[PDB]
Write a protein that binds this ligand. Structure first.
Ligand SMILES: Nc1ncnc2c1ncn2[C@@H]1O[C@H](COP(=O)(O)OP(=O)(O)O)[C@@H](O)[C@H]1O
Lengths: 787, 753
DNA sequence: AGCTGCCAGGCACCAGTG
DNA sequence: ACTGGTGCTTGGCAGCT
């Protein structure tokens, strides 16, 4: 309706609309003195989201402007509300001085708070990573980049197909996801939280390289091993531009980037991560997962590292051997190291706020406290004989000098904010504790002026006091007020009292507030100056936090191994899995009855097992424990068995309609002889035998061509004939015994096909009427007479 | 501390500042329930406390409120709230009590707002389980010696009660007292002891939560098994009646049938959907109404909408908690009745005219509320400005006095301003100082000497003078007497309205049902439904039937299908692809039966249908679950049952599964004789019709064209003669060579039989 | 311990007097 | 153009009880 041309707007709205256009789709907090305000649809939304009153800002020429707002000092509680809902918010501040500005004071968006770029402790989860990610798709593949803005961890990868792209998204589970406007495979990302559509130009390869190299201080990206990963570079370039625009400061903690090559780790598809319940159970909870058993780390950063390891098993033999050695060597040390490591806390995220220059007084306080743990940690670790632990000990560093700085600079228990001062300890700066000496030391004066004037006037109600609004005063009761000296200058009247000012008290008032201002400005400048002193050491600090997190992980793994009775696995050259008395690491902890340990023997000659046995026999658990044991071995952990020898695993596949078949094909197209394939219940055709026929042909392809290590749980008794027909296939089964009426589930794996199929017995157990089980048994004997 | 001891299993909201606060386990729990920070301590903003009580009670938590020294002044329990803010408009909220004899079960539910009070005596566990699912109580009372804890243990709002709260003699005495009856014969529950024990407990608990008479609870009804189509939880969930498999409400039967215009209508329609009645007399009557009201829905619905949730408004009347906009909405509802009475006048239908009469008019009550209350009264009566001028002479007098006093002060402002020549001069008001004369700081030194200064502001001075305080008393005493008067006249409205509560409850009930029937009429017109007919023996004959939801939700053409079931053609074996077409065909059969049996029109060109005692589905250890559901069908289905089964036998060996499907089919066809759609992949089962009377084959087929396959949804006679797994494997990308081997294997496996 | 309402500091608005 | 009063969010807290 109203024509909103430039000249139709007040200078305020011209300024505002100009800043708002700079972020058309996200809420804009617009600083107006003591309030952050919103206008138009921002006001309406904010009013709905934050439960604040929708009001109006009058207009002489035009429509009234919808309006909402909150006091500047309350902004964090509200940012919490918004980012907790996936909402970005641009934060706009007053840069200019109102007193020296004819028009509206200069304003700027200084920061944009988005779900994947938060670094404030209030807004994060301690034991969970919170990543920003960018995704890109061209004609022949995907590019993908993640950034942990709190740690600087910057990763790049190029999933070759849709299936690995999906798996990658599920693993990294970004809180915010930037995607190019021309992204075609939307089914992969639509309905993820934190979606952000971006213009194609943010993905341009040349700017990506220019910007990254600028960020890293490099001439090219060769040394980062990403110089030839253009798909990935396009996503990384977009991600980095987003990070810079949201923070609008230097990001010195983002100092390198690393490519995630497929050969470096065990690739797990979407269904495997979920079926193994690694960090999430099948109902979306965190209870009864692999992490819930293994993660007894003591620092938040360690908890997160462990979870990353578990989702990303490494295939580097030397790394694994080194972690294994570390776990052995530290086992008798865990009790003493853990209480100390605990006191280090989340050094990694504190350092993020250091690099971002947003660190608050308690952040530095906690940084100090961590530094104070280092010598003790150094002392405990000197004794331990193993190279890797000494490597970590060196990397942990010591920062006695920085520790001393923080001990001299900041009081024992600082306030939350530096905004009001009382953060910089006395003795640190001669000028400061001398402004305080004024602003504060002369508060004795008020007390004595009171008794002096009270005795001099003889008015016993006389009190000296202070009021933010009216300033310092001498107060007399209304009853006595007619008796006051005539050079008492009335300052403030109340119902039952009069308040006055005299020249002496007025001078003190200017003295106090001038020097109070001095102290606080100078204190803020000293606090900022601590950033200048700490920052030069950022790189060694991050190394330290990294060392400390890895120590937390390895120490915890040593304690788990001991307490849960785990063994060190050994690595063989050829594909294979030899397990003696293996257990399911989660199920054995959950069950309140004994877990039946089981063997496994897989080799290039015995590479596929057809697993039979009843429903509830333990086929699924057996297949899962196999993959968990492999996974654990490949993060350097000890494993829940009496002994394990394991060859290399390139990838773990899981398959347990169009969807079954499409997943099956994916195995058939991508599995290799180094793959572990776990399969169940495949073969749901439309008739009696079409499904089973596909299962048979798919198995044959896995046994004869692909040659993957394959555990194939099935109830199709026809498939127990496979070993007869093709090389590399053998039968095993989960033992069960029938005692008259019932069926006993032994949970023990035995060579050979099951003696029989127990569909009828399991049906009976479920309660199917006995007359019907009886007629079914009669039908079964007919079918079995074909043999 | 000590106040928490009074109520141990109830969260304590502790009044402390501008907030309430919970500590320890209460802070722990509250934080994980309300997405709120845990410092142990947690806080709630006073302005939005009701927004939190609603969330906590929705999750089954009672909340105790400890105001100001201090004591528990308010308690809300999930099953006994009646405030609008705490309820959801279109969902019933029930209190239930559950009891187990060394004989059978006892169950009772109460809608505390409508007063709808139901009793039943489920005979076995499954039936009791079904009852819980259907009724989904927000709060559930149970005896301490309750044996079948597995029925209830997972539920929200569990309330463990002493066994003595479940005694027959005191339950009777209490129930009789409540109803003002000598015995319960007139309610048809006099000899339903187990039911009565449950109702006894429930009613005591509800009385205890309110500490008020509950006059709107004047009746109780027994639910007998032969009265409705029984559905177990799986069947209920599988039919996505009001809840879809996801847990939501989109793409459900209600989501398509429910375009009612009042919240009470929506809630009542939903009860109907979950309780199909077997009494054709009621159905015929509902059908006739839907037919007679077809042409009228257009004019009726805008009017019915204005009636609103008169049902929950009347609860607040009965509990004496009704607020002014509650009375104005009742007024508004009253103002619709003559128009509704006039529209329904010509409708030649005895059920419609019964509704018209039972709807009433209350012209005297309408007129009262028009004279008593202003057009749009404030939310609370607390601050007055509720009672309309002209209603009470005395009231008008106190307001006129208050008004002359305030006019004088307005004129005082003017007189004092002109007289002093200070253009900032104003008269104002606040609590601390009452009436005052304000002058800006810059002018305050020109204040006239008679001005007594009382309050300095940053940029203004405030003064009093005798004249100001004189008319202050005038304003305040009159305005005081007027406010006290409003409150009495307001209470008096409850006294004049309450005697008509019974009639008023019948009226909101009539109005609710009209919303439902009129809506079903519009539905039947808009979605091209037809009126089913009822036959005496089991049978289901459908001409061109469709699935009520699929046809609306999916923007593809829906393919309609016949069905012919009778005692001579009791079971259909259904082969061919199951890519949704078999399941849909089976579910639409159930849904059509359900709709017929709530009196709705149904989506077909013609439906004749016999009596149905129960509808079972087994569609969509998995095998262990499927067999457990199969078992329940085989133990409980009769020849009046509709049994729908998909592909049992999956999840075990070919031969065990076939043997089980075969034996199950035989038992259904020959022993039970239920009307059964038996969907299967077993081609071997298509041999049943030769060996067995009353069984026949039908199948779905597909068509292969272009670079795809079109899965037809047309049900045709005979067994399927193709399988499609290989065609699917190929579309899905399974390598050509692999499918070729599968083809050879397939022929080899099939040709043996 | 309340409960009421001023104030915070931006900018625009408006009515009077140039 | 000046002058000097008004208004608008929410949270802290003085100034009354
Ligand atoms: N090795 C074992 N020892 C003891 N109990 C087991 C073992 N393996 C499985 N179970 C238990 O038996 C149940 C059936 O196991 P599952 O693997 O689901 O059976 P299947 O997949 O063969 O039907 C599981 O709930 C599990 O708790």
């Amino acid at each position: 309706s109203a024509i909103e041309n430039f000249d139709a707007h007040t200078p305020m709205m011209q300024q505002y609309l100009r800043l708002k256009a700079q972020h058309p789709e996200i809420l804009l907090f617009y600083r107006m003195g003591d309030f952050y305000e919103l206008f138009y649809d921002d006001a309406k939304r904010a009013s709905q989201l934050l439960d604040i009153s929708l009001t109006k800002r009058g207009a002489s020429a035009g429509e009234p402007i919808p309006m909402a707002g909150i006091p500047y000092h309350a902004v964090e509680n509200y940012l919490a509300k918004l980012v907790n809902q996936g909402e970005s918010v641009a934060i706009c501040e007053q840069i200019g001085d109102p007193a020296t500005s004819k028009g509206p004071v200069e304003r700027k968006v200084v920061r944009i708070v988005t779900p994947g770029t938060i670094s404030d402790e209030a807004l994060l989860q301690e034991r969970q990573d919170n990543l920003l990610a960018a995704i890109w798709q061209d004609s022949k593949g995907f590019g993908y980049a993640t950034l942990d803005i709190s740690s600087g961890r910057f990763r790049l990868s190029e999933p070759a197909d849709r299936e690995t792209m999906a798996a990658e998204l599920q693993r990294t589970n970004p809180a915010e996801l930037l995607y190019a406007e021309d992204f075609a495979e939307m089914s992969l990302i639509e309905g993820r939280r934190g979606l952000r559509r971006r213009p194609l130009w943010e993905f341009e390869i040349d700017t990506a390289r220019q910007q990254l190299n600028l960020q890293f201080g490099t001439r090219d990206l060769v040394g980062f091993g990403v110089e030839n990963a253009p798909r990935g570079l396009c996503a990384a370039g977009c991600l980095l531009q987003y990070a810079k625009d949201t923070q609008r400061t230097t990001l010195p903690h983002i100092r390198s980037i690393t490519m995630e090559r497929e050969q470096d780790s065990i690739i797990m598809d979407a269904a495997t991560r979920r079926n193994l319940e690694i960090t999430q159970n099948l109902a979306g909870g965190a209870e009864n997962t692999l992490a819930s058993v293994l993660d007894c780390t003591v620092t938040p950063m360690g908890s997160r590292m462990l979870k990353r390891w578990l989702h990303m098993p490494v295939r580097d033999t030397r790394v694994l051997l080194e972690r294994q050695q570390t776990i052995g060597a530290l086992q008798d040390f865990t009790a003493g190291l853990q209480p100390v490591l605990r006191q280090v806390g989340d050094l990694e995220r504190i350092l993020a706020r250091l690099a971002l220059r947003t660190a608050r007084p308690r952040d530095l306080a906690r940084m100090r406290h961590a530094f104070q743990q280092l010598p003790e940690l150094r002392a405990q670790l000197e004794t331990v004989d193993s190279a890797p632990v000494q490597a970590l000990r060196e990397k942990m560093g010591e920062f006695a000098e920085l520790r001393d700085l923080l001990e001299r600079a900041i009081i024992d228990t600082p306030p939350v904010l530096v905004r009001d001062g009382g953060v910089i300890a006395s003795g640190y700066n001669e000028e400061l504790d001398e402004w305080r000496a004024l602003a504060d030391g002369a508060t004795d004066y008020l007390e004595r002026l009171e008794v002096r004037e009270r005795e001099r006037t003889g008015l016993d109600t006389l009190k000296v006091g202070f009021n933010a609004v009216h300033g310092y005063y001498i107060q007399i009761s209304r009853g006595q007020s007619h008796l006051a000296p005539i050079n008492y200058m009335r300052r403030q009247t109340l119902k039952n009292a009069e308040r006055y000012i005299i020249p002496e008290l007025k001078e003190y008032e200017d003295k106090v507030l001038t020097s109070k201002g001095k102290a606080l400005a100078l204190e803020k400048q000293l606090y900022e100056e601590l950033f200048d002193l700490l920052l030069p050491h950022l790189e060694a600090l991050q190394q330290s936090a990294s060392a400390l997190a890895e120590l937390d992980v390895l120490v915890n793994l040593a304690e788990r191994a001991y307490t849960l009775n785990y063994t060190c696995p050994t690595f063989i050259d050829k594909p294979g899995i030899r397990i003696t008395e293996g257990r399911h690491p989660v199920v054995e902890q959950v069950l309140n009855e004994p877990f039946i340990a089981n063997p496994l023997n897989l080799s290039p000659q015995r590479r596929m097992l057809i697993i039979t046995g009843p429903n509830m026999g333990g086929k699924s658990t057996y297949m899962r424990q196999t993959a968990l044991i492999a996974l654990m071995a490949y993060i350097g952990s000890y494993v829940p068995a009496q002994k394990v020898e394991i060859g290399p695993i390139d990838r773990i596949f899981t398959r347990v309609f169009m969807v079954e078949m499409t997943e099956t094909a994916n195995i058939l197209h991508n599995a290799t002889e180094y793959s572990l394939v776990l399969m169940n219940e495949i073969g749901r055709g439309t008739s009696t035998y079409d499904g089973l026929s596909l299962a048979w042909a798919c198995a044959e392809n896995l046994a004869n061509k692909i040659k993957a290590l394959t555990l194939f749980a099935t109830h199709y008794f026809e498939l127990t004939q496979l070993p007869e027909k093709m090389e590399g296939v053998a039968n095993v089964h989960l033992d069960a015994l029938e005692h008259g009426d019932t069926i006993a589930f032994m949970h023990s794996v035995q060579d050979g096909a099951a003696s029989k199929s127990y569909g009828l017995a399991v049906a009976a157990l479920a309660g199917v009427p006995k007359e019907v089980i009886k007629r079914a048994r009669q039908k079964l004997r007919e079918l079995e007479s074909i043999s």
